[PDB]
């Protein structure tokens, strides 16, 4: 129930992926839509009827579909091609069930749609050629079983034509005989049926049956060779009788010379079928039985010898005789019948007609019928293979080119199509190898010269292509009788390879270049390696094979070619195919040699496998990466032990393995892929000849490409980016005054300020992007020194800034480079940040921005520089500082000047609301700078150091306080909330480092007016007390009043912070109270906290008197500042002290 | 300072006069804001040192606050004033504000309500809680004597009320612990005090803010207190109120129990834990739909001894809870009295006698609860099951017998009621024990919480290691008994996948030498078909289809019972899938089906209904959004009733 409905899905998905049907991009790289086909083919074996019927309707629907346009036609052509190919595989795949009860589908559903293509179908000169070729194979497979169905249709058409007397030209039904599979018994039926009805047919019908019946003979002979032999082995009267009756009818039909020309090819086939009539023809002739036959046979020879003055018959006699010669080959000749004798009579005459160099036999438009000559020569070879005498005629150099063209193609069929075993084989021709090679050399010499008469030149290219395909089919044919290397001259196997190699990078003759690749790839199989030099097969291979690599690799690097991505896919397999010969060679005998060429050619392979990583084509880069395994796996074979050599012969062995994994990833745009390549390119630790010359060679290309982009007043640019990214990530290898690496930087820095109207903007956007996020961590110490020196000359003598519009563009870029550079944490960077001193550059950077002025533009620079100084204080442990503290003070000096509040209201422009952000940004810089910083005053004037600091501390304290008062909400809520929070955190860090010099100035924060700010100063003060265990140990009484005053507050988060301060005091100073106190966070302390305070104060006063004087002095001072309600409290706990 | 005599003036109606004077004094305090620090020290500080007068003074505080309301100023101020009153006699105001709370809660039984907040007496409870918050600081709630009665109320209030009342309960706990660390009446060794201080820090972590229900609150103190509490009354809003989960209450309830026991180690012959238990045991077994569920989750979490007579009551509160659900239209009300009865049993079994029948008959309560199809009831059912196996091991009951033998032997006396349930649930326990006990454990994979998924995987391993150990078969052998638990563990346990590998890539699952029974191989295919019908994951669908292709060939005859289960999802995959890894095995399935066609189907799709398991694929569906009792719960009530009658006669 369900499974039938499961198949429908497999069928239904088939329709929706036919190009004419909307593609919808469901191919999924064609892997998903191709898998469905295989299922459809497999299912057909058990549900043959269902699948086939489904397929016909898909074909019928496509036929009755009208579409216009160049896209439209191409889609439907490719659409119908897939259906037919699939449909044939189902028929062939199906086991020989031989169920002949498929009549229902064949008669109506299937035959009419297959028959449609077999018509001329002149819509496409190239398309219809394939459809007939593909469709015919379907009809042949179908005819195997259901012969009666096809055969019945033909019988009807004959009867219709027979009775009717108005001649019609719709003979296409008749012409199906050319394709239906035929057997001996079936063939008899065709002859008998046509014999009865032949006489009454019209003229046109008679010709079609004759031609089609003629081609029917060859299908039987090829497909059933054995049955043909038995025909002559044992007599069969029935076969002879039917042919004889048909023979006479055809002869009666043909009277004119034009008619005789048409029918002669067939008549010989019929005569061949009746053997004994030939014998009698040789001897005395019967009155009528063998009278008509003998007249015809001798009439043939006259024209074959040129005696008659009729050209048309001369051409026809040629065709007829050739078929007789071809048919003879199948007869074993053990019978030695007259067939062999009859051919011998005509062979000598035939050759002089077809193989006379003086006179070229020209059947028609072509200068000579090239196909016909191939049939003759191939057949004659099989009859008399021992010493052919016309092989030499063609093989001779003086003979015309077409004779050469016929010779190789003739040798091409011998190798590829030899069904019968007892025939001779190609081995007999090996003796002529020496002459074959010379022909290759001369044709190669003249073919290349022409590219760099009209048809003579074109002739050579066709001959050259055929020669290359020959080496592809069989390489031993041309390698026999090797010359062996002369003392002063190269060998013969070498000269062959050098000729084949120089065709690969041509691109003048793309078809040949593709073929020479396959030819050179077959001479590398383990079988064919031996033949190069049988004396020593493991010494000439590396001498030549390696020397081929050196030639091809040097070509790829030199310049870009259209087919570069295709030579690379071939070059991968050469590497696969020369590892195996090294693997097996080493196993049998290590002894494997490494002459200088093996080194001088191993380098150039690497110098070309780097330079393909920055190639724009995604496929080229992916393939290049996978070619690194085959460079690695060769290392193991030469030396198995890892440590001894695998990291000594190939120093960067470990990273190369990483290239492989990344290649095995889903495809993504060139930008995403370049990120992964540049990561791996950055881990090449060890200098090598391959690295240090892939860097220099691609630098010279980079330098010249730049001039073209700039000087000339998108694909051109994208390459410029890729060469730059590559040439930065891989800088470290070539490292180690004037040098190629240093000149890269200078030119690189002279492009951050590149003012070019045409494309200037895109250059700067990318040089900033790369030098920051992609430079190699081995070049920081050199980037900083050059970046510093460029700046230092912005200041004239006596330290006066020289504003210039470009100088302002350079500083804005040096900030974005530095920020990205520092912000990113990567492997190995840390060790290198240390070498250089970044201080002197940072100090000079602010002064220039300090003098820039005020405007919407210059303010945003001030913002970003402040964010850089924040990031430079998260990496302070990594960096190197000559004088850390003396440098952090000046920055605080230079940054406080920019924090100016309420300047956007006086400016009266909301456009300058940014100034709020500059104050927000400046403080975050000053928090980070101050965290842990002792104060140190510049010794420009002579004052006591201790006094000097206290003056300094008050300078910043008042500054923060003033900015704090403005931020009060009563005097944007988020802005003020954050800025106020920062301004207290900035103040806390200032006090912690400098308790000794700044505690006195700071006590006034205890009674500040902002409740949220009083809690923080108390937490800071709790922290300071515990770290230890006016100095903080000399004012126990001054703090104790702050704790007790703020315990009665009205802010629930200011009571708890005050409870904790009280706890620190008793432990730190051993104050004795009644109960116990335990520091904590999260307590909910009640508001009516009055009798608690009075109880602590009463106790301390009783048995802690020495605090009295300093306690009361503060309590009175705290009375005035507090409010009315808190004033009543201060009375309550003050009295116990009096 | 002289009202002592008048307060008990022979009830001559002069007593009515003093209360008027106090009510007048209360009004000065509300209005004279500026003189507040000085009224407290003089009027209330000193008036609160007269023992005989404390009872009447306190009473007026509550009455004045009552009229204002929970957020009213009059009630807000009287909460603060009690701090000064209580400083004179901590031992007397504490044991009189606590004693009123414990009684208001005890009167909610009379007119039970779906929740406290809808009760009439709610407003009385809310204000009395603000008194407890304020008195807790500095040990003015005498913990050294009232710790039992403070935890008892904390557990009945956690995560109830407006967000102001929820930050108050958190603060109250932080103050009871702090008072312990800084109390002199108790003498805690230096070992104990380290335990307390870690507890003090833990409770302030973002973990416990979530348990109390005040996540998204930066600090609790701020929300608990309001600055302008004298000028204006509180203005509650955002009535949207989070829910509470009885699993949260255990995590808190055991955090407190850890604290208390540390103290009892030092305090000799302490009675704290025996007093707290008595308070819980009184609300646990008394009908009050607002307090009963919480008083069961607490009764079991702290109790140290349980008897048969107690267990019968717990299991008969579960029988009446089910009956109400189907009778009435109010469901959620009584679907939390069930989840609480199950959570108690998970804790009280490990205390039962070593030789009691119920140690084994609590495997059918766990099973009969998974059959109710609710995410919470399912989650609680496994936790009772998982520990039922763990407990029986430590009692060494699976030594010479197999799971099927133990649990199916005790079910025999009450087989008649059990038989009918199996008919409707569509699984059978007489036919095949180990396949009906995995139908219930395949729904676990559909639970929203990723923590109940891993608990059902552990319950599979622990069952697997017990069936094989009965046969001494290395814990990964494949047999008729131990094949169900390996199909379930196939897609989650790597050691199962490697040690049981598909033949057409040790021993290979699907062996036809041992799995030579038509029935035992019809079931094993429904388990594999089911696991993919609802699964949605590439890694799972890959592994499960490769085992179904190989099943198509090795078991040609019985495979047609797996079409409708595979029918729909494959049909969709064929049309639209674009994965070579996942599209290969599906093709292998289609080809095998057509090949082995051309024969009259020997086994139809309804082959499983014949011998019981017609519901196996249905019981593993997703949990229904339309939460309702499956309505064959009328039989679970009779089963539970017979279980009690047979094993707890009286």
Closest CA to A1021 of A1051, A1037, A1047, A1042: A1042
Q: Do B552 and B589 form a contact (C-beta atoms < 8 A)?
A: yes
Helix (H) or strand (E) holding B104: helix B90-104
Please say whether the beta carbons of B528 and B487 come within 8 A. Answer: yes
Closest-CA residue in chain B for A9?
A: B575
In this structure, what DSSP letter does residue A485 have? -
With beta carbons less than 8 A apart as the criterion, state whether A953 and A960 touch: no
A1008 Cβ contact partners less than 8 Å away, ≥ 6 residues apart: A1014, A1017
- Cβ-based burial of B387 (10 A; exposed 0-12, middle 13-18, buried ≥19): middle
d(CA B586, CA B570): 7
Q: How far is B629 from chain A (nearest CA, A)?
A: 35
Check residue A1074 and report its DSSP letter. S
Q: Which of A773, A769, A813, A775 has its CA nearest to residue A791?
A: A813
Query: How many Å apart are CA A640 and CA A633, to the nearest integer?
Result: 10
Task: Evaluate whether B583 touches B577 at the Cβ level (below 8 Å).
Answer: yes
What's CA B266's distance to the chain center, in Å? 32
Angle formed at CA A913 by CA A911 and CA A914, multiple of 5 degrees: 100
Tell me how far CA of residue B186 lies from CA of B21, B182, B271, in angstroms: 40, 9, 14
Residues of chain B in contact with residue A26, where contact means CB-CB under 8 angstroms, are 578
Three-class SS of A662-723: HHCCCCCCHHHHHHHHHHHHHHCCCCCHHHHHHHHHHHHHHHHHHHHHHHCCCHHHHHHHHH
Task: Sort out which chain B residues have CB atoms less than 8 A from A38's CB and list them.
Answer: 587
3-state secondary structure A784-821: HHHHHHHHHCCECCCCCECCCHHHHHHHHHHHHHHHHH
- Inter-residue contact A204 to A242 (CB < 8 Å): no
CA angle centred on A575, ends A569 and A580, rounded to 5°:
135
Dihedral sign computed on CA atoms, order A71, A74, A76, A79: negative
Cβ contacts of A1051 on chain B, cutoff 8 Å:
227
Among candidates B31, B241, B44, B164, which has minimal Cα distance to A1052? B164
Exposure string of A798-816, with b = 16+ CB inside 10 Å and e = fewer, is eeebeeeeebbebbbbbbb
Q: Choose the closest CB to A9 out of B200, B229, B574.
A: B574
CA distance B618 to chain A (A): 20
Query: Angle A749-A754-A759 (CA atoms, 0-180°, nearest 5)?
Result: 130
User: For residues B505 and B500, what is the distance between their CA atoms, to the nearest angstrom?
Assistant: 12
Write the residues followed by a gap in chain B (C–N more than 2.5 A). 505
Min Cα separation A180/chain B (Å): 32
The candidate with the shortest Cα–Cα distance to B32, out of B230, B190, B187, B199, is B230
**Which residue in A10, A1080, A1090 is closest to B590 by CB distance?**
A10
CA distance A297 to A547: 63
* Interchain CB distance below 8 Å, A1091 and B41: yes
Contacts of A1092 in chain B (CB under 8 A): 87, 138
Contacts of A1053 in chain B (CB under 8 A): 219, 221-222
Distance of CA A634 to the CA centre of its chain: 24
Which residue in the set B41, B181, B574 is minimally distant from A13, CB to CB?
A: B574
Q: Which residues pair with A795 in a beta bridge?
A: A801
Tell me the H-state helices in A144-256.
Answer: 147-163, 184-198, 203-223, 225-233, 237-253
Tell me the structure's resolution in angstroms, rounded to a single decimal: 3.1
Give the dihedral sign, CA B183/B184/B187/B190. Answer: positive
Q: How many Å apart are CA A1050 and CA A1087, to the nearest integer? A: 6
A795 phi, psi to nearest 5 deg: -105, 125
DSSP string, A523-553: TTSHHHHGGG-TT-TTTHHHHHHHHHHHHHH
Torsion of CA A703, A704, A709, A714, to 10 degrees: -90
CA distances from A21 to A13, A17, A41, A62, A80 (A): 11, 6, 21, 9, 12
Nearest Cα to A795, choosing from A845, A839, A857?
A845
Q: Report chain B residues whose CB lies below 8 A from the CB of A1078.
A: 178, 181-182
Secondary structure letter of residue A969 according to DSSP:
T
The conformation of residue B628, written as its DSSP 8-state character, comes to: -
DSSP per residue over B567-586, as a string? HHHHHHHHHH---HHHHHHH
Q: Contact, A918 vs A896, CB < 8 A?
A: no
- Cα–Cα distance measured from residue A842 to residue A840, given in angstroms and rounded to the nearest whole number: 6
SS3 B348: helix
Alpha carbon distances (Å) from B646 to A77, B306, B357: 83, 20, 10
Q: Quick check: A1082 and B181 CB within 8 A?
A: no
- As a whole number of angstroms, the distance between CA A51 and CA A105 comes to 11
Chain B residues in contact with A977 (beta carbon < 8 A): none
Q: What is the DSSP letter of B43?
A: I
* Distant-in-sequence, close-in-space partners of B240: CB < 8 Å, separation ≥ 6: none
* B40:A1091 CB<8 A: yes
Q: What is the dihedral of CA B174, B178, B179, B181, to 10 degrees?
A: 150
Q: Name where chain A breaks: residue before each gap, C-N > 2.5 Å.
A: 452, 591, 713, 736, 971, 1029
Q: Residue B38: which of A6, A46, A1128 has the nearest Cβ? A: A1128
User: Angle at CA A1073, nearest 5°, toward A1070 and A1075?
Assistant: 120
Distance from B310 to chain A by nearest Cα, in Å? 41
Query: Which DSSP state fits B623?
Result: P
Calpha distance A552→A560 (Å, rounded): 13
The 10 Å Cβ neighbour count of residue A182 is 22
Residue A801's φ and ψ, nearest 5 degrees, are: -65, 145
Mutate to test the interface with B, among A1087, A1089, A1093, A1119 (most CBs of B within 10 A): A1087
Nearest CB neighbour to B174, from listed A2, A42, A1083: A1083
Could you tell me which of B136, B126, B112 has the C-alpha nearest to residue B162?
B126
On whether the CB atoms of residues B437 and B427 are closer than 8 A, the answer is: no
Q: In whole angstroms, give the CA distance from residue A697 to residue A723.
A: 11
Of B203, B219, B593, the CB nearest to A3: B593
- Interface residue of B130, B574, B575, B601 to substitute, partner A, most A CBs within 10 Å: B574
Nearest to B460 by CA among B544, B381, B382: B382
Yes or no: say if A901 and A963 are a contact pair by the CB < 8 Å rule. yes
Q: Which of A406, A396, A393 is CA-nearest to residue A367?
A: A406
Does A1050 sit within 8 Å of B591, measured CB to CB?
A: no
**Cβ atoms A604, A553 nearer than 8 A:** yes
**In sequence order, what are the residues at sequence separation of 6 or more whose Cβ sits closer than 8 angstroms to the Cβ of residue B367?**
B381, B385, B437, B440
The CA-atom distances, in angstroms, between B328 and each of A890, B321, B322 are 80, 11, 11
| Among the partner residues B33, B87, B225, nearest to A1052 by beta-carbon distance | B225
What count of other Cβ atoms lies within 10 Å of the Cβ of residue B171?
Answer: 23
User: HSE of A720 in the Cβ direction (CA atoms, 13 Å)?
Assistant: 20
The answer to whether the beta carbons of residues B37 and A1128 sit under 8 Å apart is: yes
Alpha helices in A559-688 (DSSP H): 564-588, 596-609, 618-626, 629-638, 653-663, 670-680
Sign of the Cα torsion B115, B116, B117, B121 reads: positive
Angle at B346 between CA B341 and CA B349, to 5 degrees: 110
Which residue in B136, B62, B130, B129 sits closest to B94, CA to CA? B136
Could you tell me if A689 and A682 are in contact, meaning their C-beta atoms sit under 8 angstroms apart?
Answer: no
User: A896-916 in b/e burial notation, b at 16+ Cβ within 10 A?
Assistant: bebbebeebeeeeeeebebbb
Residues in B touching A1125 (Cβ below 8 Å): 33-34, 36-37
CA B232 to the chain's CA centroid: 41
Contacts of A1083 in chain B (CB under 8 A): 137, 171, 174-175, 178, 221
Task: Quickly list DSSP for A926-946.
Answer: HHHHHTT------TTS---HH
Q: Which residue of A has its CA nearest to B566?
A: A2
DSSP 8-state class, residue B138? G
Q: In Å, how far is A1058's CA from the nearest CA of chain B?
A: 14
d(CA A993, CA B139): 39
Residue of chain A whose alpha carbon sits nearest to that of B570: A6
**B590/A32 Cβ within 8 A:** no
- Paired with A801 in beta bridges are A795
State the helix-helix crossing angle for A884-896 and A856-871, rounded to 10 degrees.
150
Task: Collect all residues of chain A within an 8 Å Cβ-Cβ radius of residue B574.
Answer: 6, 9-10, 13
A1127 to chain B nearest CA, in Å?
9
DSSP letter string, B282-296: HHHTS--TTTHHHHH
Is A29 within 8 Å of A17 (Cβ atoms)? no
Distance CA(B57)–CA(B47), nearest Å, equals 9
In DSSP terms, B210 is beta-bridged to: none
Query: Does residue A1125 sit in helix, strand or coil?
Result: helix
Q: Which of A377, A309, A321 is nearest to A349 (CA)?
A: A321
Q: How far apart are CA B244 and CA B241, in angstroms?
A: 10
Short-list B308, B365, B370, B422, CA closest to B640: B365
CA dist., res. B341 & res. B357, Å (int): 19
d(CA A735, CA A741): 6
Cα pseudo-dihedral A351, A357, A363, A368, rounded to 10: 120
Contact assignment for A43 to B175 by CB distance below 8 Å: no
CB-CB neighbors (< 8 A) of B144 in chain A: none
Which chain A residue is nearest to residue B596, measuring alpha carbons? A46
Å from A1098 to nearest chain B CA? Answer: 14
Distance, CA of B329 to chain centre? 23
- Nearest-by-Cβ selection for B590 from A26, A39, A1087: A39
Q: Is there a contact between B150 and B176 (Cβ–Cβ < 8 Å)?
A: yes
Short-list A604, A695, A618, CA closest to A663: A618
Measure the CA–CA gap between B115 and B159, rounded to whole angstroms. Answer: 13
Contacts with B133 from chain A: Cβ below 8 Å? 1084
Give the burial class of A110: count Cβ atoms within 10 A of its Cβ; 0-12 exposed, 13-18 middle, 19 or more buried. buried
A948 sits in which H/E element: helix A945-966
- DSSP string over B399-452: SSS-HHHHHHHHTGGGHHHHHHHHHHHT--TTT-HHHHHHHTTSGGGG-SSHHH
Q: How many residues does this entry show for chain B?
A: 650
CB B570 within 8 A of CB B591: no
Nearest-by-CA chain A residue for B581: A32
Given a contact cutoff of 8 angstroms between Cβ atoms, the answer to whether A892 and A843 are in contact is: no
Look up residue B343 and give its DSSP letter: H
Does B37 contact A1080 at a Cβ distance shorter than 8 Å? no
Residue A1064, min C-alpha distance to chain B (Å): 15
Tell me if residue B245 falls in helix, strand or coil.
Answer: coil
Q: What's phi and psi for A1005, nearest 5 deg?
A: -75, -15
Q: How far apart, in Å, are the Cα atoms of A439 and each of A368, A436, A462, A491?
A: 21, 5, 14, 17
Enumerate long-range contacts of A146-150, CB under 8 Å, 24 or more apart: A146/A100, A146/A102, A146/A103, A146/A106, A147/A180, A147/A181, A147/A186, A148/A100, A149/A103, A149/A106, A149/A107, A149/A111, A150/A106, A150/A111, A150/A176, A150/A180
Burial pattern A304-324, b for ≥16 Cβ within 10 A else e, equals beeeeebeebbbbbbbbbbbb
Nearest to B36 among A26, A1080, A1125 (CB): A1125
From the list B37, B203, B221, which residue is nearest A1128 (CB)? B37
Q: List chain B residues with CB under 8 Å of A1091.
A: 40-41, 45, 83-84, 87
SS3 content of chain B, % helix, strand, coil (to 5): 65, 0, 35
Cα–Cα distance, B213 to B48 (Å, whole number): 37
How close does chain A come to B241, measured CA to CA in Å?
Answer: 24
| Rounded distance between C-alpha atoms, residue A478 and residue A470, angstroms | 9
């Amino acid at each position: 129930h369900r499974p039938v409905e499961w198949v429908q899905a497999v069928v239904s998905r088939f329709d929706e992926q036919l190009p004419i049907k909307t593609g919808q991009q469901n191919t999924h790289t064609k892997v998903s839509t191709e898998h469905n086909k295989e299922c459809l083919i497999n299912i057909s074996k058990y549900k043959f009827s269902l699948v086939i019927s489904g397929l016909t309707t898909i074909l019928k629907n496509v036929n009755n579909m009208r579409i216009f346009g160049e896209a439209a036609e191409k889609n439907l052509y490719l659409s119908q091609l897939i259906i037919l190919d699939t449909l044939e595989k189902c028929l062939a795949g199906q086991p020989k069930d031989t169920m002949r009860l498929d009549e229902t589908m064949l008669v109506k559903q299937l035959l009419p749609e297959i028959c449609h293509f077999l018509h001329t179908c002149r819509e496409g000169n190239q398309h219809a050629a394939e459809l007939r070729n593909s469709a015919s194979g379907v009809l042949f497979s179908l005819s195997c079983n259901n012969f009666n169905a096809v055969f019945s249709r033909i019988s009807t058409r004959l009867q219709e034509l027979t009775v009717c007397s108005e001649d019609n030209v719709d003979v296409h039904d008749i012409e199906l005989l050319q394709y239906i599979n035929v057997d001996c018994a079936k063939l008899k039926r065709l002859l008998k049926e046509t014999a009865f009805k032949f006489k009454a047919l019209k003229k046109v019908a008679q010709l079609a049956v004759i031609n089609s019946l003629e081609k029917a003979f060859w299908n039987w002979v090829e497909n059933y060779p054995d049955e043909f032999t038995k025909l002559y082995q044992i007599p069969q009267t029935d076969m002879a009788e039917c042919a004889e009756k048909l023979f006479d009818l055809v002869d009666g039909f043909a009277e004119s010379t034009k008619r005789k020309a048409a029918v002669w090819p067939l008549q010989i086939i019929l005569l061949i079928l009746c053997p004994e009539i030939i014998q009698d023809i040789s001897k005395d002739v019967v009155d009528e039985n063998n009278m008509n036959k003998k007249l015809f046979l001798d009439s043939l020879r006259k024209a074959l010898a040129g005696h008659g003055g009729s050209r048309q018959l001369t051409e026809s006699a040629a065709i007829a005789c050739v078929k007789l010669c071809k048919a003879s080959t199948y007869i074993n000749w053990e019978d030695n019948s007259v067939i062999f004798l009859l051919v011998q009579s005509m062979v000598v005459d035939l050759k002089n007609l077809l193989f006379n160099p003086s006179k070229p036999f020209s059947r028609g438009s072509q200068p000579a019928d090239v196909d016909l000559m191939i049939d003759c020569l191939v057949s004659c070879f099989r009859i008399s293979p021992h010493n052919n005498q016309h092989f030499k005629i063609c093989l001779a150099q003086n003979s015309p080119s077409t004779f050469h063209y016929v010779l190789v193609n003739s040798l091409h069929r011998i190798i590829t199509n030899s069904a019968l075993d007892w025939w001779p084989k190609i081995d007999a021709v090996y003796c002529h190898s020496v002459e074959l090679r010379n022909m290759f050399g001369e044709t190669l010499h003249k073919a290349v010269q022409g590219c760099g008469t009209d048809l003579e030149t074109r002739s050579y290219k066709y001959l050259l292509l055929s020669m290359v395909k020959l080496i592809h089919a069989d390489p031993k044919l041309l390698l026999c009788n090797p010359r062996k290397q002369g003392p002063e001259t190269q060998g013969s196997t070498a000269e062959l390879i050098t000729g084949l190699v120089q065709l690969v990078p041509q691109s003048h003759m793309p078809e040949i270049a593709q073929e020479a690749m396959e030819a050179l790839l077959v001479l590398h199989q383990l079988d064919s390696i031996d033949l190069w030099n049988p004396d020593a097969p493991v010494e000439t291979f590396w001498e030549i094979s390696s020397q081929m690599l050196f030639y091809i690799c040097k070509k790829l690097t030199s310049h870009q070619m259209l087919s570069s991505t295709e030579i690379l896919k071939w070059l991968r397999e050469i590497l696969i195919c020369r590892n195996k010969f090294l693997l097996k060679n080493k196993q049998a005998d290590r002894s494997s040699g490494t002459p200088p060429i093996c080194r001088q050619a191993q380098t150039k392979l690497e110098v070309a496998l780097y330079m393909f990583l920055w190639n724009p084509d995604t496929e080229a880069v992916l393939v290049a990466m996978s070619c690194f395994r085959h460079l690695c796996e060769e290392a193991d074979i030469r030396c198995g032990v890892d440590e001894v050599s695998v990291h000594n012969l190939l120093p960067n062995y470990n990273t190369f393995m990483e290239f492989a994994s990344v290649s095995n990833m889903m495809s993504t745009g060139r930008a995403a892929l370049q990120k992964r390549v540049m990561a791996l390119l950055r881990r090449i630790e060890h200098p090598t000849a391959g690295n240090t010359e892939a860097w220099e060679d691609t630098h010279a290309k980079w330098e010249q490409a730049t001039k073209l982009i700039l000087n000339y007043p998108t694909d051109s640019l994208q390459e410029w980016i890729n060469m730059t990214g590559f040439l930065c990530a891989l800088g470290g290898v070539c490292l180690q005054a004037d040098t190629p690496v240093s000149k890269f930087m200078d030119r690189l820095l002279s492009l951050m300020v590149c003012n070019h109207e045409k494309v200037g903007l895109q250059i700067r956007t990318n040089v900033k992007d790369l030098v920051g996020l992609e430079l190699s961590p081995a070049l920081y110490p050199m980037l900083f020194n050059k970046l510093k020196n460029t700046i230092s000359k912005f200041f004239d003598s006596q330290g006066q800034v020289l504003l210039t519009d470009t100088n302002t563009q350079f500083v804005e870029q040096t900030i974005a480079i530095m920020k990205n550079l520092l912000d990113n944490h990567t492997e190995g960077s840390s060790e290198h940040l240390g070498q250089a001193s970044i201080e002197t550059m940072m100090l000079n950077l602010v002064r220039y921005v300090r003098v820039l002025g005020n405007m919407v533009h210059a303010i945003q620079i001030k913002t970003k520089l402040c964010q850089l100084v924040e990031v430079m204080m998260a990496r302070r442990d990594d960096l190197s500082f000559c004088q850390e503290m003396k440098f952090r003070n000046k920055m605080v000096e230079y940054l406080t000047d920019w924090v100016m509040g309420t300047s956007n209201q006086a400016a009266d422009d909301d456009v300058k609301c940014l100034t709020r952000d500059l104050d927000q940004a400046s403080m975050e810089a000053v928090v980070s700078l101050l965290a842990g910083l002792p104060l140190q005053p510049e010794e420009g004037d002579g004052v006591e150091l201790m006094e000097a600091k206290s003056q300094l501390f008050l300078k910043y304290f008042t500054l923060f306080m003033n900015l704090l008062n403005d931020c009060s909400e009563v005097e944007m809520s988020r802005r003020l909330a954050s800025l106020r929070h920062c301004t207290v955190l900035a103040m806390s860090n200032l006090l912690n480092a400098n308790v000794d010099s700044g505690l006195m100035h700071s006590i006034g924060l205890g009674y500040h007016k902002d409740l949220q700010t009083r809690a923080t100063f108390m937490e800071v003060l709790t922290k300071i007390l515990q770290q230890g265990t006016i100095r903080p140990k000399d004012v126990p009484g001054t703090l104790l009043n702050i704790a007790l005053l703020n315990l009665g507050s009205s802010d629930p988060s200011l009571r708890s912070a005050a409870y904790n301060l009280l706890c620190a005091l008793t432990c730190t100073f051993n104050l004795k109270i009644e109960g116990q106190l335990l520091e904590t966070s999260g307590l909910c302390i009640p508001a009516n906290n009055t009798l608690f305070i009075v109880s602590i104060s009463k106790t301390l006063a009783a048995n802690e008197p020495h605090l009295t004087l300093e306690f009361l002095e503060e309590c009175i001072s705290g009375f005035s500042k507090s409010s009315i309600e808190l004033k009543h409290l201060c009375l309550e706990y003050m009295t116990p002290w009096l």
